[PDB]
DNA sequence: GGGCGCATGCTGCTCTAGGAGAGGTACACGGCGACTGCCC
DNA sequence: GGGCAGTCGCCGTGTACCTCTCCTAGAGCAGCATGCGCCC
RNA sequence: AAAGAGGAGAGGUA
């Protein structure tokens with residue numbers, strides 16, 4: 001909604017399936033925020049690299065995450081004024097859509113937030129006492145699901161850093177970047193986008209979003225109801241000759 | 251027993267040869283991969299006759 | 301020569317097996333003209349043991365990929381993709397038309413400068 | 421025959437990994453919002 | 461241009477209590493105790 | 501000073 005693009009294009013720029021034009025340059029067919037392909041990028045690369053003139057417009061087409069750069073180029077006040085001006089001369093379903101966008105934009109002005117904060121550079125790690133290891137099994141150890149996801153994320157990060165250090169060819173690095181993105185996605189919310197991570201048996205793991213979600217989540221199990229001390233339970237029989245305010249306790 | 255009923259399917263879907271049918275089977279069963287006659291034969295044999 | 305260099309994704313710790321199996325298959329199929337040579341680049345680096353002495357053992361530079369010199373043709377692609385312990389080629393991914401799962405990966409050769417750099 | 425040396429099956433330490441399907445498929449039911457086809 | 465109509469995907473589906481079992485991963489590599497052959 | 505950690509199946513009683 002913020003970038004005014006369909007979800008398919010944004011999903012294709014991420015996960016390394018297409019390119020995006022970050023700067024048209026002095027071209028006649030290229031446009032800002034235009035989806036490209038491998039063959040088309042090859043054609044434009046042949047055109048620019050033919051050592052010709054009139055193409056020295058610095059065409060910047062980067063097919064990567066490349067969302068931080070697009071979100072960093074946003075000016076909120078100018079877009080707010082433009083949308084407010086354009087709202088009046090419109091009607092029907094065309095107006096409503098614009099209204100929606102306007103809403104979001106004004107939010108980012110009220111809270112003084114930056115739209116590029118939706119792309120992550122650092123990841124928090126939960127305290128270790130909330131994901132215990134447990135020392136049963138005699139010689140083995142218990143299974144916890146958060147630790148596996150954290151370990152996978154760390155492994156992918158270390159491999160990508162090592163590959164980047166020694167200047168590997170830039171067709172193997174993109175693979176590692178894609179697997180790192182998928183690993184982080186699986187850590188946050190398992191099965192929301194693509195395939196689900198499966199443990200030993202064909203049973204999906206429990207992510208961070210599965211702890212707070214449903215009937216067995218934190219809210220409806222540990223906060224709105226609890227187990228208590230000083231309580232008992234037993235079978236009931238009938239006692240006549242009692243008073244209406246009395247009971248019999250073993 | 252009613253051959254005139256299948257004529258509609260033949261007309262509205264066109265006619266095929268063995269190799270063209272195998273190529274079409276590969277195309278629809280495995281999207282994206284380059285079609286091949288031997289490939290489609292392999293899918294058919296591994297699907298319904300192995 | 302049209303024989304270009306490609307990278308193939310294999311299983312973890314299953315690169316020597318893939319190399320041996322692929323070379324044996326390509327020899328027994330009399331297709332040595334299409335697939336020329338497969339390799340797993342290595343580099344000896346200091347491997348300091350319990351004491352201060354370095355074992356200086358060999359480790360892989362790309363732990364998970366194997367390099368193949370071949371002429372990219374349909375049949376050779378079919379033989380290569382049918383080898384056990386091989387996931388897929390390395391290249392440009394494509395959007396899956398319908399349903400979930402991965403798409404079709406178009407192979408891409410290594411540039412002459414890179415292939416010069418890896419091969420000293 | 422007997423002590424010793426080597427081959428070998430058994431088993432415990434280790435580490436590492438972690439990708440991607442193989443196929444376990446085809447398999448409930450209602451309500452609501454977000455795209456897309458083919459025509460007027 | 462302007463849509464209707466159709467289709468696809470995500471959300472939801474009462475409460476307390478009792479008993480029995482199986483599992484925390486799986487494959488490579490090296491140490492070891494055993495069996496069998498050898499030279500005196 | 502110490503003492504139980506979770507998970508998954510199957511079967512019951514209001």
Ligand SMILES: Nc1ccn([C@@H]2O[C@H](COP(=O)(O)OP(=O)(O)OP(=O)(O)O)[C@@H](O)[C@H]2O)c(=O)n1
Nearest residue numbers: 234235236237238473474475476477512513514
């Ligand atoms: N799925 C169920 C089954 C039973 N109950 C509880 O258990 C009671 C069943 O009582 P029960 O003794 O089995 O039957 P009654 O209807 O009382 O009839 P009777 O005692 O005469 O057989 C229900 O009313 C209800 O309080 C329930 O909550 N949920």
